[PDB]
Symmetry: D3
Subunit: 137 residues, 6 copies
């Protein structure tokens, strides 16, 4: 499948999780769009133009993807990821979530997920072809 990796990527622990998710999913044969690899170094970093193109390229890759794969733990920086999960739900993309902390996530996110994971071995054995439901409970 084509997967949009929705996760922050600004500190060491966030990068650990994104890096692993890139590795697990790509090693399964999936095409993963990971926003940290597309910083758009063609316009001025942080300009209005840069903000606009980052948004447009990320949103257009959520629409391009088959599945949105999110990562949310306790690094309370989840506002961009949360937005992209909500957008993905309305766009009709199956939403998957990996939580490293295994904590309690907001109702709107958990109720919208199609598959929820807390260990990478379960992602590695999940049937992306038939896409079985694995709800948060």
């Amino acid at each position: 499948a084509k997967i949009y990796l929705a996760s922050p990527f600004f500190n060491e622990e966030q990068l650990k999780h994104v890096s692993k998710a890139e590795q697990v999913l790509r090693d399964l044969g999936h095409t993963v769009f990971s926003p940290r690899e597309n910083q758009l170094p063609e316009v001025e970093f942080g300009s209005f133009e840069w903000r606009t193109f980052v948004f447009k390229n990320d949103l257009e890759h959520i629409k391009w993807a088959d599945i949105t794969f999110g990562i949310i733990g306790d690094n309370y920086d989840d506002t961009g990821t949360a937005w992209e999960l909500g957008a993905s739900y309305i766009l009709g993309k199956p939403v998957m979530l990996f939580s490293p902390t295994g904590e309690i996530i907001n109702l709107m996110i958990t109720d919208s997920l199609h598959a929820y994971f807390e260990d990478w071995n379960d992602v590695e054995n999940y049937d992306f072809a038939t896409l079985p439901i694995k709800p948060y409970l």
Copy 2:
């Protein structure tokens, strides 16, 4: 206009801002759905029935609304609100955002909003009929 009020309401400070938003928008004549008034009275709290009905009722009222009015502050509790603004954007609802702090906001949210406010008198003078653009700058 019909307005969905997207905001956390889980501690005293968040409740203060929600209360002011309800009062301001309703005194302007708008019909406001405020999720805190719709915690359902009373399916057992936290049951599967309760989680389902709250999610479904909330989402249906985003769909019913003309405009989604969000409150984003210093909260690190903005996960569900951020999700509701992403859903709203895909659903084609104009997003208005109020920030009690005036801090920097994630670019997925700032690039998705139609009008941005940092004072309630600015909301009180906004032309809801014509919906002029009021971007985050």
Copy 3:
């Protein structure tokens, strides 16, 4: 509210229920599109032109409506109505359903409705402005 009245209208009993729905919803001040009043006067009945315009006009009026109000009974004629409720749900129109029989209804319909009624006085007291949830239980 603008209301699309989804119901069969092909025998005397179905016509009775449609007529009562028209009267009740219109006496409440709502603007009701009733497909039986829009059989088009008169492109040749059953022509390709007639089939096209009726389909297009009906679907456009589901899109124009705020709410789709359906009548599901003992009809085994509910095919087009059921189709219109599925379309309505994806289009983000709140679905209200009235069942003259109170029998068991398919779970794709019951899990898609926002308000369920078995008596017209309950419809007469429903708050259309706030659209409270009234689930099938």
Copy 4:
């Protein structure tokens, strides 16, 4: 392609048609989601929770599919299938319909189809890659 099989599956004749459709389409190399194979025996059959998850998993597989393949004859149990065909149309999925009775189907269904079949040999020779229109007439 990925195909959602929309059909009842509760009596012998309905099961005959679903079984054949599973067989024909899968033998062509398509990935078929057939709701009768996913009864969700992880929660209590018939509970509110079961109804909710069946709806969510079926709807999420319509969104996952490329094409919705319906079966409608004269076994007047078509209300769930009709709903899913209407949803599929608004979601933008090409809708295909196989009718064993070859009778007259409601306007909203026939006008929404992309391909209509009355014999399995025609499905077996249809070009799913180019998806030519084969309208009901």
Copy 5:
């Protein structure tokens, strides 16, 4: 109704038709967003900021509108207008079209419109509340 006025406004003749449309639709009591009044006062003309805000404000006002009212004439300048009618159609906005010339129109546009006009008195008598179909013939 809220109406998005889709039309070029780049020479004297196009401006004449836009002006008459504004006057007619506003004298009927409608709330009209007219893109020529929203060239933004004044982000630098033609800047990236200006191109972004105009696009975003225009699209947001198509989403805000109940109806998109288009003017298609002898213009070979109808590119953006044609784009806005295609977007409108997918967004589920009923499309009304006025042609100052009465010439032949592309079938993607004629097969997407809900009401077609060649005289302003016909627009003045149109029932906007019920939105009757008025096809291009």
Copy 6:
């Protein structure tokens, strides 16, 4: 990928560009739907029925496609193509545009594109798998 080729095809220069686009994209392994190859010679050319089925089959192939690939130059016949680009944008399809004249195209089109090309060698080296943004500037 599956690509919808949005372009006029009525004069020699338009046919040159469509023919080349068919050739380049298909030689890359993409499945291209080109409307000129599907004239529907099963009903009467130019009838109402023909106009209806051409629209339905073209729209249904835009929805079937992964990407919409447009061609717009100075052959001012772009009203159907413009419509299909606007529809494709709202449907969530990445929009690509090849311009032979390399001129100035309307704001709504250029701002909506994901990839813009003026030479076929660039299309031949573009990564359709990762779909990088190549904006008009």
